[PDB]
């Protein structure tokens, strides 16, 4: 459900 | 398992309009311990935000300001909640700088999770 945020 | 980092804000990230442009808000992560702490920022809608930095190490005694940039929109209508964030932290092992394998190696009691909700004003 949570994914690594991207920049 | 208790979060050793200080978070400001700790519960709600507030984004003020207009929402036709990017909205940047700050997330300050502070490390009050004598050890370096690794962190990862996750969200339920990664295509809707630009988060810088999104992962890294906060040295003992230091703080870091994470820029959380709400984009005007994305092309992912299948993203469930546009409104949840999570900061995950773990102590950096002594003789280690390849963070990737550390996170994989990690036992659940070694991971500290802090959840935040986004509010659009």
Numbering used by the authors:
A (entry chain B): 501 to 507
B (entry chain A): 4 to 124
Sentences from the study reporting this entry:
Mitoguardin-2 (MIGA2), a mitochondrial outer membrane protein, forms the ERMCS in higher eukaryotic cells. Mammalian MIGA2 has several distinct domains: a mitochondrial targeting transmembrane domain (TM) at the N-terminus, a coiled-coil domain, the FFAT motif, and a large C-terminal LD targeting domain. Here, we report the crystal structures of the MIGA2 LD targeting domain and the major sperm protein (MSP) domain of VAPB bound to the phosphorylated FFAT motif of MIGA2.
To answer this question, we solved the crystal structure of mouse VAPB MSP domain bound a phosphorylated FFAT peptide from mMIGA2 (residues 289–298, referred to as mMIGA2pFFAT) at 1.68 Å resolution. The overall structure of the mVAPB-mMIGA2pFFAT complex highly resembles that of VAPA-ORP1 (rmsd of 0.74 Å over 108 Cα) and VAPA-STARD3 (rmsd of 0.81 Å over 112 Cα), which possess a conventional and a single phosphorylated FFAT motif, respectively. The phosphorylated S292 residue forms an ionic bond with the side chain of a conserved K87 residue of mVAPB and also associates with the K118 residue of mVAPB via a water molecule. To test whether these residues are genuinely responsible for mVAPB interactions with mMIGA2pFFAT, we generated mutants (K43L/K45L and K87L/K118L) of mVAPB and measured their dissociation constants using ITC. While wild-type mVAPB showed a dissociation constant (Kd) of 1.7 ± 0.2 μM for mMIGA2pFFAT, the binding affinities of K87L/K118L and K43L/K45L mutants were 3- and 5-fold lower than that of wild type mVAPB, respectively. ITC measurements demonstrated that wild-type mMIGA2275–570 could not interact with mVAPB, whereas the S292E and S295D phosphorylation mimic mutants of mMIGA2275–570 showed binding affinities (Kd) of 26.4 ± 6.8 and 8.1 ± 1.5 μM, respectively. The S292E and S295D double mutations synergistically increased the binding affinity to 2.5 ± 0.3 μM, suggesting that both phosphorylations are needed for association with VAPB. In this study, we showed that phosphorylations at both S292 and S295 of mouse MIGA2 FFAT motif are required for its tight interaction with the VAPB using structural and biochemical analyses.
